[PDB]
Amino acid sequence: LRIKEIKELLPPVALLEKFPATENAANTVAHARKAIHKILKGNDDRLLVVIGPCSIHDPVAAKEYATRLLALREELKDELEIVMRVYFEKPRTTVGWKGLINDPHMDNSFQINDGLRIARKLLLDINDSGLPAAGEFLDMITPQYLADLMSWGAIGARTTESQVHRELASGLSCPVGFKNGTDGTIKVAIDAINAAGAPHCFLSVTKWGHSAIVNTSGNGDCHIILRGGKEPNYSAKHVAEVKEGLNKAGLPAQVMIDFSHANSSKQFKKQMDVCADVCQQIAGGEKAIIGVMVESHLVEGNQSLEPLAYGKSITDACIGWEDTDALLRQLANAVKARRG
Amino acid sequence: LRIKEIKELLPPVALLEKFPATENAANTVAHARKAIHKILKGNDDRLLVVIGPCSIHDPVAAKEYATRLLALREELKDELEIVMRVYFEKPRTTVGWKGLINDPHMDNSFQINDGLRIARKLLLDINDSGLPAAGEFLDMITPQYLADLMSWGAIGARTTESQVHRELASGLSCPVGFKNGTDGTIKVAIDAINAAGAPHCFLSVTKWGHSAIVNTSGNGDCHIILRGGKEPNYSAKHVAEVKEGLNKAGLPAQVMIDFSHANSSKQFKKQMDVCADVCQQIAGGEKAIIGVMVESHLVEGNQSLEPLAYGKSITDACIGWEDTDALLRQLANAVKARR
Amino acid sequence: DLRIKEIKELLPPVALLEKFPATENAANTVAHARKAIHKILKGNDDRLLVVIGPCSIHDPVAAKEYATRLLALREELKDELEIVMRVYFEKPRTTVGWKGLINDPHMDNSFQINDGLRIARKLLLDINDSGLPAAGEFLDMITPQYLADLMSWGAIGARTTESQVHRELASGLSCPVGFKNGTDGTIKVAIDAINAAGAPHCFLSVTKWGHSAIVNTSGNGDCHIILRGGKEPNYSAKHVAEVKEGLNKAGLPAQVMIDFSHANSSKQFKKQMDVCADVCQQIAGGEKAIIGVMVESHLVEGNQSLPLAYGKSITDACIGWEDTDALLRQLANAVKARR
Amino acid sequence: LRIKEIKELLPPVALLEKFPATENAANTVAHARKAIHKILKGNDDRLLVVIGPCSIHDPVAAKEYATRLLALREELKDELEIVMRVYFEKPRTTVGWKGLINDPHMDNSFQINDGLRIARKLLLDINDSGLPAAGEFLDMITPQYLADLMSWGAIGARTTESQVHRELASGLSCPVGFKNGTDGTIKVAIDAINAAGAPHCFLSVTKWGHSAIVNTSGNGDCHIILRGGKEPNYSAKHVAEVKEGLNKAGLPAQVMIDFSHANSSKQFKKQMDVCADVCQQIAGGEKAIIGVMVESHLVEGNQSLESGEPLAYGKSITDACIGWEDTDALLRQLANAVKARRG
Ligand SMILES: [Mn+2]
Ligand SMILES: [Mn+2]
Ligand SMILES: [Mn+2]
Ligand SMILES: [Mn+2]
């Protein structure tokens, strides 16, 4: 057999019981999800900004980052709907650290039970403070432990074509963004949007930790995320091609632009160059750009695991706080312009 | 909330107790795995052939096929290691019938518990008769119900890059084939193979239907499956590149070619052409092609979902049985030649 | 977990119900018998319920024969007797010792409980499928889910009649239940139990899926006392009179079942024939209160402490098959006379 | 089926995760269990005293009671090992309220999940303050939710002869007292102690709320509790018969004497008469009485839920209890008797 060991996993209700959502958290989640729906509908011209660390690996710095982001979110709330990237799971090209839930101690001890406790506790505190959270829904089982605290979800580029993740999205209570494929393929995401908007029936694990059959109603709050492929795809030239591609599919012509990953050619400072370009489209009148995604942290760049520096990514390189404050105002100014 | 209803699901242990493995089936799966391994390790010059319906949606028409294919398996056994495509789950481009397990009655009634019973019984019978089975591992929970009766599995083109599927593969007891991406990307498959060969720790459901933390050891019996992209990729040209690309990744230069889907340009008919070419390469001495995959049925073509025509696919179009017998012999001959 | 040495996996009830589902006949056997016993307890049938068989099942082979022999008599004496076979898989001990077939089927302290459950339900399904109803002591709180659907009548042991956990269980069983008087001979505990089991209860229990849950029961109106003796026998007309007045005072139907064995036969199997004579006279005399009896019989007579003599009890001593034939006929005549 | 409905039950881990033992709560339990073991082994001459309400029906009054009891626990600790009765499960003669866990709101809404949360939170608070807790282990599934916070347990008179309860005790991490039968029968408790001291294999539910097969090691920290029968059984005469009976069965010759229930002829103030008699036995040299049990509350007597009459605060809704004043005097008498025995 190829399975070496099987260990006990706390059931979702154990985490929900230990860390129940507070009234403030519940409100943060509810208002944030509606606000995003309004933007996706068209009843709102604000820009959805999902911004924060490539991955969370330290609750202390994540808490400090949340406090600074919250101030900006309130200050720029008339132009931006700021949601913090609180990613607990990371998809790897081959092998590597999978995130805080899978291995919180970052030493391959895989204390998943500690991971879930730490993750939910952090998620709860950020929402309770009034700051909404976004995360990638990669794993099929972890959602029951955290979904109630998520205001927006992302389906990775390596799983957007996966029926299992399209199924998951069809039952999620929050808006969902589907990234285009690693090679830059737009089709997989347009297809994913159609599929996740349709009712689904499949096997899942309940809040009680038991497998069951579930039926979903389909998720209408789904959109594409442009994150580049072999070449970047954030340009007006690409945004045009994608708007037409969505209409031809009978979907609203809307996109979220991730300034990182393939769009910045994996060099963190370039996210500022993508920002400038996108802000020109927005300020120019482009009303299809519904939101943006940015990899930001307290300190710029990154560091490897293979004692840590405070507030610096251990996964993808991020822009630092100074660039973050500036990028956010750039986006807000572009929004005030596109308005007129 | 976007969750309509939640219903009871029989735990794996319930399907295993009601439909246990017969001594035959148990040996039919074990021998086949050892054989497939033996081939991947280069201690066998035979060719793995994964052939059968795109999808199983009729145990009757399915049993007749298993019946006919089993003969050819014994007949062409010195050249070919024939394994039937017993696919219970299907990934759709957008939406559609997901397979026997998800909606066996094909009426969107989704009687999955009957689906699992029906599926494991059929799989058990085919295995009992001596014919190995293959399928695509799509779902993360269904594996516990059927895995003990699978001799080879495949990760779909749309899920080869998916970390949850590479995790699943690292813990499966049978050889696994990873299809190249829909656009034809080879790297996703090469990366999947390296990932699947390493140990993993993740969440999964046990035989008791309970989520748990699992540690796998990694699966070395993995390989790529060329299934085409924007353009077909079965020619000696693509094989040569993919052979070079594997070495770069420090992996054995071996491949499986699927004659259908993108390689046949979605024309079951064209599988015979692809067959010729592959036979030419094998006949020429190409020792890299360690296996092939063909989508066939009793009656060629395909139909869509009202009563249905018999033995005709309800998903991807397949070649009929006549072509199958000939195709299987074309391949067996090439093997003898290559030898 | 200081005093917990080990924890092992247990098959959920659905696993046993899936492997061994109840045949159409088995279900009919159970439904009719329960209905019949209900009719007798409601005083709308002058027949006598007769729970007879071994002290404990320890060999499916002998038990299947015993069952075949009894079925002949059940069909024969069917107009005066409602014969139900004692198929006891759990035995409560005074201190320690063998707890029965489910707990340790291999009778070698290997506690292969999962096997015990397979054997027990299979044997119980067989007996029922043939048309012979079954009776057993419900001792464990978790085993009922695996066998209850095949039980027509159940007993609560003298050592657990006063226990609230057993009274709750009884309140939700789908079959009639008999409560034995205390081991010291105390009647009140059984009277209190009938009243307790007749009311609705809410308590924790394990579902068919093997998960704990909150359960609400409706209450069981089909409960009655079983006179099994104490410091001395309590089967005489004098005791019967006293128990009937006791039941009336407690607002319960004045009826009883008399166990010819255990404390009433002073632990001497042969003495069961004497109790039979007495009870027969009572029934012949017009005693409508004696609604049933319980007898410990087997293929052969006696007891043997754990080769094993085939068809011989390994727990309490029983009367042989001949005395059994004589006993069942003696009872049927008495019933004929009463009527 | 006579099964009206089935509802979801939080698994033990959910309660354990929501209400984990604090360092002080875990220390209270480990120290109490060790202290009781020492008394049972005859390595300590103090008297174990399990005292408190017949049943817990109100967390507020339970905590006010625990504060007063803790003060005495600390003051008389040289003579007494005081443990509070925190009983969440009640076995009824026929039907009735089964305790806080089964029906916390005492109105037949049976909110068991809430009951479990309320019970464990109250137990954690009492243990964290340094006061150990005792309870009756009646139900087969509730133990997993609360056992880690129990320092001593009882098997009641109606279940001492039950195999499923003897099996449970054989696997419990705390010392366990077995009450004699309701009719006065001593043998069932002697057999129970012997049965519980042996390893067993049976079916139970895990902390994950799943049924499983379990193997226990046997529990050697078990003893008898004399609680009366048709006649009280606390007198020297009975204590001698029982010590001789345990000896004959090869068990330590020792007993806990419950001053209540049938030993007080169900007259709550008679517990004071039992106390006086037991104190004279202890002060006169009796060493085999290793513990006593007392039904005590803030206010004396009892009240009924079936009278519609509003509930008085700190007054039992099941068996009648002595009030606080008598409790303080009784505890001091016992400590004084122990001091006298030590001489
Ligand atoms: Mn990243
Ligand atoms: Mn296909
Ligand atoms: Mn017996
Ligand atoms: Mn009491």
Side-chain angles (χ1 to χ4, degrees), chain D residues 9 23 41 45 51 55 64 96 114 118 125 136 140 155 163 189 196 214 227 239-240 255 270 276-277 291 294 300:
Chain D
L9 175 68
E23 171 184 2
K41 285 305 187 190
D45 64 0
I51 176 166
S55 61
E64 171 158 17
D114 281 334
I118 290 170
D125 292 332
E136 169 175 340
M140 293 295 100
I155 298 303
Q163 191 164 255
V214 182
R227 49 76 73 200
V239 168
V255 307
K270 283 287 187 54
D277 186 271
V294 176
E300 80 168 20

Side-chain angles (χ1 to χ4, degrees), chain D residues 5-73:
Chain D
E5 61 158 344
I6 302 213
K7 280 172 279 181
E8 329 232 357
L9 175 68
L10 288 169
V13 284
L15 279 295
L16 294 178
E17 287 296 318
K18 187 168 179 69
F19 302 112
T22 52
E23 171 184 2
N24 207 55
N27 284 179
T28 299
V29 174
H31 295 345
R33 287 174 176 174
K34 172 188 166 70
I36 295 178
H37 171 75
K38 280 198 52 173
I39 288 166
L40 293 181
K41 285 305 187 190
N43 292 148
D44 185 18
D45 64 0
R46 295 185 305 142
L47 180 77
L48 162 62
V49 181
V50 174
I51 176 166
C54 171
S55 61
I56 295 308
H57 78 270
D58 171 27
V60 181
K63 290 197 291 323
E64 171 158 17
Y65 184 93
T67 303
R68 302 189 191 182
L69 189 58
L70 177 62
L72 260 26
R73 164 181 169 77

Side-chain angles (χ1 to χ4, degrees), chain B residues 271-279 281-286 288-333:
Chain B
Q271 297 183 64
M272 304 305 294
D273 297 339
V274 184
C275 182
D277 189 307
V278 177
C279 279
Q281 301 185 47
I282 300 179
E286 176 66 85
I289 304 179
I290 48 74
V292 289
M293 168 178 295
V294 181
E295 286 191 316
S296 80
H297 223 312
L298 303 177
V299 180
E300 75 190 32
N302 65 293
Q303 67 180 312
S304 88
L305 272 48
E306 231 258 356
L308 290 20
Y310 177 84
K312 211 176 172 191
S313 179
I314 54 169
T315 47
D316 291 330
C318 307
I319 52 164
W321 182 262
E322 193 180 15
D323 300 298
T324 299
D325 176 284
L327 166 136
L328 285 169
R329 298 172 185 296
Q330 278 194 49
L331 304 171
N333 287 311

